[PDB]
């Protein structure tokens, strides 16, 4: 096999996504070279769980899943297994048995506007915590209190989504951060995606 895994379509896309509606891409039947990844000298965070971030280009995986986000910098630590917070349980939940790698880099030069970038959203209110690897794109009105909310927002009926509204003047903890999560699977099935060996 000689196909090259399409990391460019996910690591260099113009606009990635909103956190609450993160898109997932299935990488399989291809050859992935990780030299460009861990030796880019541009990723602020390259935290690998369950695998050594240096020898990941020599063991073969059954398939890979690439997930994208644009989040707030100070919230990046919430994208680790076990950690909980505002986006770790209402927007994106990682299983405690994770075996992937979380990559994150600051992108205030592409995902910020002087007036304000009200184009990236995250879920603020939800009835219960998200299950591991679950999406929730429904915009149903969050019924707080006791009186039913018949579909019209107002008093005691909140709108679940909220906007980050990035600006190119906030601190490093309030600037955009592009995040890519690579989930592997060390199953017993015959592997089909992995880096060049011989």
């Amino acid at each position: 096999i000689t196909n090259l895994c399409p990391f460019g379509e996910v690591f260099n896309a113009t606009r990635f996504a909103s956190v609450y509606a993160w898109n997932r891409k299935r990488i399989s039947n291809c050859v992935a070279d990780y030299s460009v990844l861990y030796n880019s000298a541009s990723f602020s965070t390259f935290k690998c769980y369950g695998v050594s971030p240096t020898k990941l280009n020599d063991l073969c995986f059954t398939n890979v899943y690439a997930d994208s986000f644009v989040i707030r910098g100070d919230e990046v630590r919430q994208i680790a297994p076990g950690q909980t917070g505002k986006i770790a349980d209402y927007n994106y939940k990682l299983p405690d048995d994770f075996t992937g790698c979380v990559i994150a880099w600051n992108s205030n030069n592409l995902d910020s506007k002087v007036g304000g970038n009200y184009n990236y959203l995250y879920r603020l209110f939800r009835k219960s915590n998200l299950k591991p690897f679950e999406r929730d794109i429904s915009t149903e009105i969050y019924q707080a209190g006791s009186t039913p909310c018949n579909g019209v927002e107002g008093f005691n009926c909140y709108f679940p989504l909220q906007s980050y509204g990035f600006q190119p003047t906030n601190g490093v903890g309030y600037q955009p951060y592009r995040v890519v999560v690579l989930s592997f699977e060390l199953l017993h099935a015959p592997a089909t995606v992995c880096g060049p060996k011989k």
Partner: antibody, heavy 122, light 111 residues
Framework: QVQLVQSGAEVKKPGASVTVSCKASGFLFTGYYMHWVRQAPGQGLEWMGWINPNSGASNYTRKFQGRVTMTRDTSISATYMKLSRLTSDDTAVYYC???????????????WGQGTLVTVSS | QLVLTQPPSASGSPGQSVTISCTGTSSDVGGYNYVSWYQHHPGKAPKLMIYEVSKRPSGVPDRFSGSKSGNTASLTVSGLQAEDEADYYCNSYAGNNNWVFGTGTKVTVLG
């Protein structure tokens, strides 16, 4: 610091439409509900309506139902209010106010605009 | 249409305390604990004196104190000084996603 700037004073003939704008700066535009209030000459305050600058939802009082429409423009971070079918009993000063709570509506109007004077006469 | 009643006027010599009462139906004031008080000066936009029922926004002094009992809210100003001449309004939630302002009280420093 925050800042809400309204459109200039307007004079309209009876039976017309007035579009008053409120531009917000210095804070997260989407996340604080906006309220529109009115004060006629020597009549005290009067709460007109309520608009959400995030989802675009809004609600009014039965008095103004079918006459007032509120809109948002997040591209320039502005809130527009259109009052149609004016009458001599509508000349007043209109204020756009920012709610206090975050992502919720509670009626605490901590920050206020400057007040736009709208006059209707023949 | 619903209306919240307030006394036509209130007065007090500089130094002592004055009180303003805002009365409404049980579905306006008694029903919910959201009764804010605003101060309005001539030529300036109204300023939020207190919100909720007793909380004070940053900036206002300790003179103003609000409290609600039964179906009536009350705002008390202590250490009245000459700069308190203004119209005080009570804003309350009235159900059906609607807020209602009171008639307002013009406070006069008398002396």
């Amino acid at each position: 610091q925050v800042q809400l700037v309204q459109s200039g004073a307007e004079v309209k003939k009876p039976g017309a439409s007035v579009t008053v704008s409120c531009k917000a700066s210095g804070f997260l535009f989407t996340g604080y509900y906006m309220h529109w209030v009115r004060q006629a000459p020597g009549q005290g305050l009067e709460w007109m309506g309520w608009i959400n600058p995030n989802s675009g939802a809004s609600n009014y009082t039965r008095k103004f139902q079918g006459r007032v429409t509120m809109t948002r423009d997040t591209s320039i971070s502005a809130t527009y209010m259109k009052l149609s079918r004016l009458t001599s009993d509508d000349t007043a000063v209109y204020y756009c106010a920012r709610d206090l709570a975050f992502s919720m509506v509670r009626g605490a109007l901590d920050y206020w605009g400057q007040g736009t004077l709208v006059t209707v006469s023949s | 249409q619903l209306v919240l009643t307030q006394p036509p006027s209130a007065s007090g010599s500089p130094g002592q305390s004055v009180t303003i009462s805002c009365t409404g139906t049980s579905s306006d004031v008694g029903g919910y604990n959201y009764v804010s008080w605003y101060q309005h000066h001539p030529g300036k936009a109204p300023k939020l004196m207190i919100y909720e029922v007793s909380k004070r926004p940053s900036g206002v002094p300790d003179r103003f104190s609000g409290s609600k009992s039964g179906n009536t809210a009350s705002l008390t100003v202590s250490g009245l000084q000459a700069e308190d001449e203004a119209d005080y309004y009570c804003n309350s939630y009235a159900g059906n996603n609607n807020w209602v302002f009171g008639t307002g009280t013009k406070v006069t420093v008398l002396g």
